[PDB]
Amino acid sequence: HMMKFTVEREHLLKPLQQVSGPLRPTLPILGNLLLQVADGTLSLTGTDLEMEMVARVALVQPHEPGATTVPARKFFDICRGLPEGAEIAVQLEGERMLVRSGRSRFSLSTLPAADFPNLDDWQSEVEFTLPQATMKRLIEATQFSMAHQDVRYYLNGMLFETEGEELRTVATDGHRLAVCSMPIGQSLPSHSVIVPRKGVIELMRMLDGGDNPLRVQIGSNNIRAHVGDFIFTSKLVDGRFPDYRRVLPKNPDKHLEAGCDLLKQAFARAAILSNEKFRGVRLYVSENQLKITANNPEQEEAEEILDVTYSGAEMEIGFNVSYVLDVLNALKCENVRMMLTDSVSSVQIEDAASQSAAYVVMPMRLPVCAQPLLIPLRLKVSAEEKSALEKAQSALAELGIDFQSDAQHVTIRAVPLPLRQQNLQILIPELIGYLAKQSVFEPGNIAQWIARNLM
Amino acid sequence: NLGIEENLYFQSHMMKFTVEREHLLKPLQQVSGPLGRPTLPILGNLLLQVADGTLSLTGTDLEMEMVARVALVQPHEPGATTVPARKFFDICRGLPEGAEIAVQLEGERMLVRSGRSRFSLSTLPAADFPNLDDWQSEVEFTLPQATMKRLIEATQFSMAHQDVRYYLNGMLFETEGEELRTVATDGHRLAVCSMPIGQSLPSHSVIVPRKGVIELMRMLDGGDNPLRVQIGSNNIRAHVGDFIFTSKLVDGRFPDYRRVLPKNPDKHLEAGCDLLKQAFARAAILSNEKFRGVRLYVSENQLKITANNPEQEEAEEILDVTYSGAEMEIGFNVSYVLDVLNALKCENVRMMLTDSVSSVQIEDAASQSAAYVVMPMRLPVCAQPLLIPLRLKVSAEEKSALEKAQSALAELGIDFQSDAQHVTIRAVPLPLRQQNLQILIPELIGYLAKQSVFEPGNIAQWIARNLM
């Protein structure tokens, strides 16, 4: 136990702030940082068992090799609380790590380095170098469309895919979809992985926007990113991520262009008087004009009229204004293009001046109105489940629930709005379970059960 | 148009005005202060009144109200209504800079237009909007905004948070001679500050609730308009430019800071504020998370600060101070000391000591306008002295049990005096002191009153079981 080093506070700060990223404590040692002195390099490692961040620091002042682990937040808070220009002397003593700087002495408790978890090494299948700005672009373009604590864990992450000369990101939560692709100047093998949420955040955090390039390595179950003296490694998420190609409108035949800023501020004002639960707003598009309207159960109303570029047929179409605003914020461009097919068909939004990013939002139709799903929900069903569904189909249709039955599968294509704005992966199998218990199907009873159970 | 009652309704809903967005923003922000609370629907609304050539905006939460006057330089019609505050403000804020906002009423709705943006807001009758009961001031005076800002910022941090003693959650405003004074305390630490305001004032002592203090701070614009204050028996009012703030006062027996200040500090220590703060801040990192205790070792022109935690981690800071006198060791809750040092914002700090078991006064070395009291921490259980001895009414039965149990309680670090029908707690062990003894002790006394024997071990077990 004789690791030792002395470093100027300035050189230690940024690496410490960085490796305290993977860091409510999960388990004791995961709140600690692994410190390794080897050669003339100090290595700092932070991990949460799903990912790890390693930071290297060159040591010019005297040092002895060794390794230990110390509380991350405490060690960092001490360094940060010392004056600018200060010197930080570290030294192991027994089961304690001593930190000195001037007449400030600190004794921290340690846990052995040999107990610090390692990631089992792996083999990269893909390797490429790209500018930091490019990676930051790809993530910021799609990050907001990631799911949050979905039961489908693969949606809580971000798809990274290499195709030809391009790196692509995809994110969706089942209600909306963000896709962005950028060239990276070299032919790559076809690969497709899901990076979990925390990893994407951490990946974004290690990028300073600098012109020094990012080195990426992708294996089957791990991804590794090297920038400057930082090395980020993360586990990948398994699961069948949906295919963005099927989500894009088949063929838009109507398109409008508008100033991003004006359209966004207009939607933002309208949203104030939209339903707080469903957040619907109406668009009426006509020649070179757009009329946005919103109202709520208190029958308050907002109306916005903008000049736009549009020469298609007039059309009325509703949206979740929160999803539209999310897209317009992420774009941050001059003009936006909205590609439309018809109400009841998915809408595609892009920067008017570039096709690198594309966004998909489902319209809101306005007995009960059947709202189309972003992605049709396909579910395996037993003979008994199937029979219950077929008996209840017409009763379900009256509630706005449309579906198709294959041999041993059902495909939900539409549901009423209150269900669509929730997780159908959870709700529909509950609905199926409930239906299998019945022999007589009426819309009233079903509606009442859904109303009291699926909400 | 021809219906007579229908005509009266139209004359009732004539309110109309047109104002620049930038003339409306700061006033809407200001009056939305007292307000996401679903307390009552009407309380989420602003009152709008066009009278004379002035638009008045009023927001309230029934404990206080903020009124803003806006001069109307464009055509307008008199009238009144109420509209949802957050919505109306978000609409105005969301409109482009330089926008003209035209408002008028149509039935039970308020219409807002600007360019080609139209909004329809639901209203509630102005008649239903609460009006604070009229009252008469007993004291009027004016002072610079910066002085009020100083008085409040010097003491605000020491106010209790959600204490069951509501008077501790507010701030004492006191007029004495030519000075305005603020006092705040949570039973554990105390902040007092006084400023001369250049005029003789009648003696007065009121408690402004926390929300009132915050609002009072929010209406100070660092401009050069003076602040005109009115204090009544049960209300306070503050006028700044186009804003009038009114607040109900809190009643209760606020502690006397005169008694909390150390009687006669025979030792003093001076030190650079920033140096001292940074030393404490670093030492704090390795102090007990619950008790936050650090030790001072004072010697000739040297201060050593130490801290350790249950994991036996350890911090030490040695810095140069100005000090002549006997060596002494004293302990503090570092969080309270760090609060004080952050509030001082000065070059040098004076620390007036006497000993442990005695309150410690802290000041700007160059200014005595503000003073801060913290109680030392002593590390038979150590008896930690209370900032304010707790005087409790006791029944004959309760007093009898206390007399019997006094020796046992003393072993637990609980010290108290007793007088005809009262008992005065002067000290308790540390875990009790850092809690609310106004709740805990009357409970404990209830317990002791129901007991046959008094063994310190048993009582200590009970306390730890029920009072923590």
Side-chain angles (χ1 to χ4, degrees), chain B residues 364-367 369-378 380-398:
Chain B
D364 191 336
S367 173
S369 50
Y372 302 90
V373 186
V374 296
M375 299 305 294
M377 188 180 307
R378 324 185 45 211
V381 184
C382 280
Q384 311 295 345
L386 281 49
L387 181 79
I388 299 155
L390 178 54
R391 188 148 177 287
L392 296 168
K393 168 76 192 89
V394 300
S395 68
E397 167 181 32
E398 283 176 343

XYZ file of all heavy atoms in Angstrom, chain B residues 364-398, unseen atoms left out:
257
model
N -18.772 40.720 11.308
C -17.783 41.336 10.443
C -16.804 42.053 11.361
O -17.216 42.783 12.258
C -18.438 42.310 9.459
C -17.485 42.779 8.370
O -16.256 42.748 8.588
O -17.970 43.183 7.292
N -15.511 41.832 11.155
C -14.506 42.472 11.995
C -14.551 43.987 11.831
O -14.151 44.727 12.730
C -13.121 41.941 11.663
N -15.055 44.437 10.686
C -15.077 45.858 10.352
C -16.465 46.475 10.502
O -16.647 47.665 10.244
C -14.573 46.058 8.934
N -17.442 45.673 10.914
C -18.814 46.156 11.047
C -19.597 45.368 12.089
O -19.526 44.142 12.136
C -19.533 46.088 9.700
O -20.907 46.400 9.842
N -20.357 46.086 12.910
C -21.124 45.477 13.990
C -22.623 45.623 13.754
O -23.428 45.433 14.666
C -20.735 46.106 15.327
C -19.238 46.082 15.601
N -23.002 45.973 12.561
C -24.389 46.145 12.185
C -25.109 44.775 12.321
O -26.295 44.728 12.608
C -24.552 46.714 10.742
O -23.779 45.974 9.806
N -24.409 43.696 11.941
C -24.975 42.355 12.017
C -24.248 41.520 13.062
O -23.057 41.709 13.300
C -24.913 41.677 10.658
N -24.982 40.604 13.686
C -24.412 39.677 14.661
C -25.040 38.303 14.477
O -26.203 38.192 14.098
C -24.627 40.180 16.085
N -24.261 37.260 14.749
C -24.711 35.887 14.555
C -24.321 35.015 15.729
O -23.164 35.011 16.151
C -24.126 35.319 13.263
C -24.489 36.134 12.051
C -23.689 37.185 11.633
C -25.644 35.862 11.334
C -24.026 37.940 10.527
C -25.987 36.607 10.231
C -25.177 37.645 9.833
O -25.519 38.393 8.733
N -25.296 34.275 16.251
C -25.062 33.396 17.384
C -25.218 31.938 16.987
O -26.213 31.543 16.381
C -26.017 33.698 18.550
C -25.637 32.865 19.772
C -25.983 35.173 18.890
N -24.206 31.155 17.337
C -24.246 29.712 17.205
C -23.834 29.123 18.543
O -23.068 29.733 19.288
C -23.319 29.205 16.089
C -23.781 29.732 14.742
C -21.875 29.614 16.362
N -24.350 27.940 18.848
C -24.070 27.309 20.124
C -22.928 26.323 19.981
O -22.893 25.550 19.024
C -25.317 26.610 20.656
C -26.473 27.561 20.898
S -26.007 28.927 21.982
C -25.695 28.063 23.515
N -21.975 26.349 20.927
C -20.872 25.403 20.779
C -21.322 23.964 20.931
O -22.375 23.677 21.506
C -19.922 25.790 21.909
C -20.794 26.407 22.934
C -21.827 27.166 22.144
N -20.503 23.069 20.402
C -20.765 21.647 20.452
C -19.672 20.988 21.274
O -18.486 21.112 20.969
C -20.822 21.078 19.039
C -21.267 19.635 18.941
S -21.313 19.067 17.229
C -22.338 20.318 16.454
N -20.083 20.305 22.332
C -19.142 19.689 23.247
C -18.967 18.220 22.885
O -19.928 17.450 22.898
C -19.631 19.851 24.683
C -20.338 21.190 24.928
C -20.701 21.392 26.385
N -19.599 21.042 27.275
C -19.749 20.559 28.505
N -20.961 20.360 29.012
N -18.679 20.270 29.231
N -17.739 17.845 22.539
C -17.424 16.468 22.171
C -16.181 15.985 22.907
O -16.095 14.821 23.296
C -17.218 16.342 20.658
C -17.261 17.625 19.826
C -17.864 17.331 18.457
N -20.950 10.188 31.838
C -22.093 11.083 31.710
C -22.103 11.654 30.262
O -21.026 12.040 29.830
C -21.781 12.173 32.738
C -20.319 12.310 32.617
C -19.774 10.938 32.314
N -23.243 11.743 29.555
C -23.272 12.303 28.169
C -22.983 13.814 28.285
O -23.405 14.414 29.256
C -24.625 12.070 27.416
C -24.587 12.566 25.978
C -24.997 10.594 27.509
N -22.300 14.439 27.317
C -22.059 15.861 27.346
C -23.413 16.581 27.269
O -24.151 16.178 26.392
C -21.129 16.345 26.217
S -19.437 16.072 26.542
N -23.685 17.637 28.045
C -24.954 18.389 27.989
C -24.679 19.510 27.015
O -23.800 20.277 27.226
C -25.408 18.934 29.356
N -25.408 19.564 25.923
C -25.244 20.624 24.936
C -26.162 21.796 25.276
O -27.371 21.614 25.382
C -25.553 20.103 23.531
C -24.862 18.795 23.169
C -23.352 18.917 23.095
O -22.806 20.017 23.040
N -22.672 17.776 23.086
N -25.602 23.007 25.440
C -26.471 24.127 25.809
C -27.414 24.552 24.690
O -27.023 24.545 23.523
C -25.474 25.241 26.114
C -24.367 24.964 25.165
C -24.220 23.463 25.212
N -28.640 24.916 25.052
C -29.623 25.397 24.087
C -29.376 26.861 23.755
O -28.982 27.642 24.622
C -31.046 25.229 24.634
C -31.715 23.853 24.579
C -30.812 22.759 25.111
C -33.006 23.893 25.380
N -29.605 27.229 22.496
C -29.548 28.622 22.072
C -30.472 29.470 22.937
O -30.095 30.528 23.432
C -29.945 28.748 20.601
C -29.912 30.153 19.991
C -28.488 30.554 19.630
C -30.822 30.236 18.775
N -31.690 28.972 23.109
C -32.736 29.643 23.867
C -33.289 28.650 24.883
O -33.949 27.688 24.495
C -33.867 30.142 22.946
C -33.319 31.148 21.929
C -34.996 30.777 23.756
C -34.132 31.237 20.659
N -33.008 28.861 26.180
C -33.560 27.941 27.181
C -35.062 27.769 27.030
O -35.780 28.748 26.836
C -33.214 28.620 28.508
C -31.993 29.399 28.212
C -32.185 29.909 26.808
N -35.521 26.525 27.102
C -36.907 26.208 26.800
C -37.758 26.219 28.061
O -37.662 25.326 28.902
C -36.991 24.850 26.108
C -38.389 24.335 25.766
C -39.170 25.358 24.953
C -38.283 23.020 25.008
N -38.600 27.239 28.177
C -39.439 27.408 29.353
C -40.780 26.734 29.129
O -41.512 27.079 28.203
C -39.633 28.888 29.669
C -40.343 29.145 30.985
C -39.861 30.439 31.621
N -40.569 30.746 32.860
C -41.826 31.179 32.917
N -42.528 31.349 31.803
N -42.385 31.435 34.091
N -41.092 25.766 29.984
C -42.305 24.974 29.843
C -43.175 25.043 31.084
O -42.683 25.033 32.207
C -41.959 23.514 29.549
C -41.247 23.273 28.221
C -40.690 21.864 28.176
C -42.198 23.525 27.056
N -44.477 25.118 30.853
C -45.465 25.016 31.909
C -45.590 23.550 32.308
O -45.661 22.675 31.446
C -46.802 25.586 31.424
C -48.001 25.305 32.309
C -48.006 26.171 33.550
C -49.034 25.665 34.541
N -48.453 24.653 35.461
N -45.601 23.283 33.611
C -45.694 21.914 34.106
C -46.728 21.800 35.220
O -46.871 22.696 36.051
C -44.328 21.397 34.622
C -43.298 21.418 33.501
C -43.837 22.213 35.817
N -47.454 20.689 35.222
C -48.427 20.417 36.270
C -47.698 19.980 37.534
O -46.496 19.717 37.502
C -49.420 19.343 35.823
O -48.781 18.086 35.687
N -48.425 19.907 38.643
C -47.841 19.494 39.916
C -47.303 18.068 39.821
O -46.235 17.757 40.348
C -48.870 19.603 41.029
N -48.054 17.208 39.140
C -47.654 15.823 38.933
C -46.391 15.738 38.081
O -45.476 14.971 38.384
C -48.793 15.041 38.273
C -48.400 13.675 37.725
C -49.562 12.964 37.058
O -50.433 13.654 36.485
O -49.609 11.716 37.107
N -46.352 16.526 37.011
C -45.205 16.551 36.114
C -43.967 17.073 36.831
O -42.878 16.518 36.688
C -45.505 17.415 34.886
C -46.403 16.743 33.857
C -46.757 17.660 32.699
O -46.592 18.889 32.843
O -47.200 17.153 31.645
